[PDB]
């Protein structure tokens, strides 16, 4: 197993997966890690184990069609992994916390949303539909993007929707299209 966790890269309290090398903090992963369960499975692990068990899962779908499933164990368990994916990246930390609002010529957004939000959103089991977390999660880079306007600030959240975006496709396996 490694010695860090696989999410912010660090030592510490790390919990270790039985079936592949990866660790994880205790609240890195998502969900957070289990109590008991030997052995215990990674939330990698588990994904890879649905496209396993039903290959043609990972031929194109259409988002719209995404975004209308309900949040069946599934959906949840690709939408946490979704969220787990962002956390990866360390620009994640502009967007975990909730945000404040007071820049000379800038007004607020009527709606802030971030990450950790969204995470306790999923935990809490208050999406119905895929749509809802993932209208969430873009929320998050397009309030930054209004607010912080021609400060090139605001391409910290183009980078990070960018990952969030890519793994989008992946997790979810949007067709490609030009
Ligand atoms: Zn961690
Ligand atoms: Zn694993
Ligand atoms: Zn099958």
Not at 21 to 33: D, L, N
Not at 34 to 52: D, G, L, M, V, Y
Not at 110 to 139: A, C, H, I
Request: glycine residues 4%; neutral net charge.
């Amino acid at each position: 197993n490694s010695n860090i966790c696989e999410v912010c890269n660090k030592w510490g309290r790390l919990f270790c997966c039985d079936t592949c090398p990866r660790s994880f903090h205790e609240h890195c992963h998502i969900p957070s890690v289990e109590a008991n369960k030997n052995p215990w499975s990674c939330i990698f692990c588990r994904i890879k184990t649905i496209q396993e068990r039903c290959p043609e899962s990972q031929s194109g779908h259409q988002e719209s069609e995404v975004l209308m499933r309900q949040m069946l164990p599934e959906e949840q368990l690709k939408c946490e992994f979704l969220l787990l994916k962002v956390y990866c990246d360390s620009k994640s930390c502009f967007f975990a916390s909730e945000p404040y609002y007071n820049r000379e010529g800038s007004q607020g957004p009527q709606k802030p949303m971030w990450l950790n939000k969204v995470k306790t959103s999923l935990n809490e089991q208050m999406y119905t539909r895929v749509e809802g977390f993932v209208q969430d999660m873009r929320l998050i880079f397009h309030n930054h993007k209004e607010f912080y306007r021609e400060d090139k600030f605001t391409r910290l959240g183009i980078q990070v929707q960018d990952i969030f975006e890519k793994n989008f496709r992946n997790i979810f396996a949007i067709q490609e299209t030009s």
